[PDB]
Amino acid sequence: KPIVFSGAQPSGELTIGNYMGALRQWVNMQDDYHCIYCIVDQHAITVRQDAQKLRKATLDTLALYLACGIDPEKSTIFVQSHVPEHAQLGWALNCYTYFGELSRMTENINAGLFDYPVLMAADILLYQTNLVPVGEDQKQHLELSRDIAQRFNALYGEIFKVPEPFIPKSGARVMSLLEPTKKMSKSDDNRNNVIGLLEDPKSVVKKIKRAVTDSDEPPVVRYDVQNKAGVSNLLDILSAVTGQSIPELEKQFEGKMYGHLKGEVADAVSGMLTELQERYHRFRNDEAFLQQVMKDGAEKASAHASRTLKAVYEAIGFVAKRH
Amino acid sequence: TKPIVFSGAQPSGELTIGNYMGALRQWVNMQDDYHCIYCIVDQHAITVRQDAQKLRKATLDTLALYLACGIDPEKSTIFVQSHVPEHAQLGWALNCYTYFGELSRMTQFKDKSARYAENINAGLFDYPVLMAADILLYQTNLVPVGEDQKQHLELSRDIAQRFNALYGEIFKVPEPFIPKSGARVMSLLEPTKKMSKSDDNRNNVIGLLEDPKSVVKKIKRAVTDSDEPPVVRYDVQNKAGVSNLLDILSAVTGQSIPELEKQFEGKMYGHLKGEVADAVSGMLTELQERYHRFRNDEAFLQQVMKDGAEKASAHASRTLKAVYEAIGFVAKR
Ligand SMILES: Nc1ncnc2c1ncn2[C@@H]1O[C@H](COP(=O)(O)OC(=O)[C@@H](N)Cc2c[nH]c3ccccc23)[C@@H](O)[C@H]1O
Ligand SMILES: COc1ccc(C#N)cc1
Numbered sequence: 001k002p003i004v005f006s007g008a009q010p011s012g013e014l015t016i017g018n019y020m021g022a023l024r025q026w027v028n029m030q031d032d033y034h035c036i037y038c039i040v041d042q043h044a045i046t047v048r049q050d051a052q053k054l055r056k057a058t059l060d061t062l063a064l065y066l067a068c069g070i071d072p073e074k075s076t077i078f079v080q081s082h083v084p085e086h087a088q089l090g091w092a093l094n095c096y097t098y099f100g101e102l103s104r105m106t107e108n109i110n111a112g113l114f115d116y117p118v119l120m121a122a123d124i125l126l127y128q129t130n131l132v133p134v135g136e137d138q139k140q141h142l143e144l145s146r147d148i149a150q151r152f153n154a155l156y157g158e159i160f161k162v163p164e165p166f167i168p169k170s171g172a173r174v175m176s177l178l179e180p181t182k183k184m185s186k187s188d189d190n191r192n193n194v195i196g197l198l199e200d201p202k203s204v205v206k207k208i209k210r211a212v213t214d215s216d217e218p219p220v221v222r223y224d225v226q227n228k229a230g231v232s233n234l235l236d237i238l239s240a241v242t243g244q245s246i247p248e249l250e251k252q253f254e255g256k257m258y259g260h261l262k263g264e265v266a267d268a269v270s271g272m273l274t275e276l277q278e279r280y281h282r283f284r285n286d287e288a289f290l291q292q293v294m295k296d297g298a299e300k301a302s303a304h305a306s307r308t309l310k311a312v313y314e315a316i317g318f319v320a321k322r323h
Numbered sequence: 324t325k326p327i328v329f330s331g332a333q334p335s336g337e338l339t340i341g342n343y344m345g346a347l348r349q350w351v352n353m354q355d356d357y358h359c360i361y362c363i364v365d366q367h368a369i370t371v372r373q374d375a376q377k378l379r380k381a382t383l384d385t386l387a388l389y390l391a392c393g394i395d396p397e398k399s400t401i402f403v404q405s406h407v408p409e410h411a412q413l414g415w416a417l418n419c420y421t422y423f424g425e426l427s428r429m430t431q432f433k434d435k436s437a438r439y440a441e442n443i444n445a446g447l448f449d450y451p452v453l454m455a456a457d458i459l460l461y462q463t464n465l466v467p468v469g470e471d472q473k474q475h476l477e478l479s480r481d482i483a484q485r486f487n488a489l490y491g492e493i494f495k496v497p498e499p500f501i502p503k504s505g506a507r508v509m510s511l512l513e514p515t516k517k518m519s520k521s522d523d524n525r526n527n528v529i530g531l532l533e534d535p536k537s538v539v540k541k542i543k544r545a546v547t548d549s550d551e552p553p554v555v556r557y558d559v560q561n562k563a564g565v566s567n568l569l570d571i572l573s574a575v576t577g578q579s580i581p582e583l584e585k586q587f588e589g590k591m592y593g594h595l596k597g598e599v600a601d602a603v604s605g606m607l608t609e610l611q612e613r614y615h616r617f618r619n620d621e622a623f624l625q626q627v628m629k630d631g632a633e634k635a636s637a638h639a640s641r642t643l644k645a646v647y648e649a650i651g652f653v654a655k656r
């Protein structure tokens with residue numbers, strides 16, 4: 001099976017777009033690929049934050065990924081800082097990364113924020129990764145990882161796999177509620193544009209009620225991204241939740257107003273989130289289970305990472321550690 | 324418990340009399356008075372591109388050199404940097420508490436990027452942060468180094484204070500231990516330039532493993548000055564060569580500069596160079612005799628590395644655990 005690597009930020013407030021898009025896509029491919037999920041706490045600290053909140057956010061993220069369907073017996077899930085090899089390879093790869101390559105990435109800035117693309121390269125290359133599902137903002141970072149890998153391989157032989165982007169997109173379409181021309185993003189400052197995965201039925205109703213529609217007369221529930229972006233977004237959200245096709249929903253809402261659509265979307269989404277939240281709280285409140293998942297995952301990750309790091313260290317010429 | 328000493332040297336190039344005077348000499352003398360930890364910093368060495376076989380051999384050359392100088396593994400912890408993962412781990416963490424501007428303003432980064440224009444890599448830039456991690460891991464009180472590492476030391480103090488101010492008494496704020504003489508031994512044909520173990524012009528350098536005969540010839544050919552009459556007097560501005568020779572003589576013999584000036588009253592540069600050559604030739608012959616005894620004993624070198632990495636890891640793991648707890652990471656099971 002090809003090896004797939006994904007970094008999970010312990011701070012990202014995930015949305016229904018993240019879930020019904022990429023995450024649900026990947027949950028159903030855990031037997032097709034050897035999937036690795038790395039909770040990237042070492043990347044998180046490039047932005048200063050409260051220590052207690054970071055610890056909590058790491059465990060929140062773990063429980064949420066488990067709740068979404070990431071299975072720790074099928075896939076490898078672990079906390080980045082638990083595997084020393086990440087930092088070790090990161091330092092080594094700094095020495096095969098041009099300063100220029102980092103300065104070109106798209107004085108009071110901390111060095112972690114400057115240097116984290118090299119750590120990301122190490123994160124990926126440690127596991128002989130074949131595929132990396134990246135968003136547009138991470139394309140440059142992936143390209144650097146490929147250039148580092150090829151550069152190192154040209155000097156020392158085929159030590160790393162050259163990773164590839166995972167090209168196919170999920171197919172689910174979730175746009176911002178007050179700005180339906182742009183994608184619903186977990187990075188949005190305006191939280192009224194998004195539905196978070198831990199929101200209750202009342203919060204979801206409130207946000208869907210506010211969602212931008214059009215001034216068509218009569219109001220008509222039809223799919224048209226150009227002229228009816230808001231109504232189309234509501235249809236896409238509903239279709240993604242229920243599995244009903246757009247033409248099926250258009251027929252279902254024949255002669256109905258936008259109030260009735262919004263009510264059905266709210267109910268459908270909250271139906272989905274209530275089951276996700278049950279699983280989340282069950283996992284999140286079981287400290288023993290989470291500790292076992294992290295220990296097992298770090299052990300699996302470490303076994304693989306140590307093999308790659310040993311090959312790297314031998315290639316570079318370091319005197320082998322005496323155990 | 325005793326206060327802690329930490330210092331390191333790269334296994335790249337070939338250690339010079341400069342490296343001995345500025346650092347190793349002090350390392351040997353501090354072993355009873357403080358709890359001393361000395362490191363072969365192979366992860367720093369790879370910031371300059373080396374052949375893999377050269378790197379491995381140089382790591383073991385450096386280890387044998389420490390032993391030959393008088394670094395006793397029964398008194399001091401001696402280890403190879405890459406054998407202790409905590410250096411890399413803390414070095415990443417400390418990147419997040421170091422400003423880009425602090426690194427871009429470094430003299431060593433600018434001198435190194437000038438000399439290695441075709442390999443201005445991120446490791447060369449990030450060098451000082453790993454060095455800070457090297458020191459801070461061991462609750463280090465004293466860092467014996469040459470003058471050229473003063474700026475790197477200042478940063479490691481700033482990082483410790485900055486981190487401590489946020490999180491509590493996690494690190495000791497280390498202090499430099501720079502000797503009065505021999506802190507910055509200068510090149511023999513270019514006494515305004517520091518003596519460098521990676522100098523192309525070999526005649527600028529006195530190698531620790533160089534043939535003493537070759538070293539005595541280099542001393543005889545060292546540039547002095549046009550003073551008429553010749554006068555053996557300390558003046559770095561107008562008498563750089565003679566000053567460097569006096570500084571070398573002072574550092575080997577332990578005699579002060581005014582003592583040497585009185586000693587060479589009425590004498591000229593032949594006397595000075597004779598006495599310098601004698602002192603240095605004697606040191607290196609002895610040093611190199613001990614060296615081969617250690618260097619060819621692979622079982623002993625293996626044991627020293629094993630024991631040292633064990634002792635180091637115990638200290639480093641303690642510090643990293645406190646650092647990780649303070650910043651907010653979930654503790655490893
Ligand atoms: N011409 C000279 N005259 C007097 N002293 C000199 C001369 N040239 C070099 N030195 C000193 O020798 C030590 C080793 O040199 P390195 O280049 O390996 O030294 C270096 O490049 C360090 N960054 C290695 C290091 C890495 N981590 C550390 C932590 C603590 C102390 C030192 C380190 C150094 O103390 C250096 O000051
Ligand atoms: C590029 O990632 C890293 C940079 C520096 C260190 C260290 N020490 C570890 C990782």
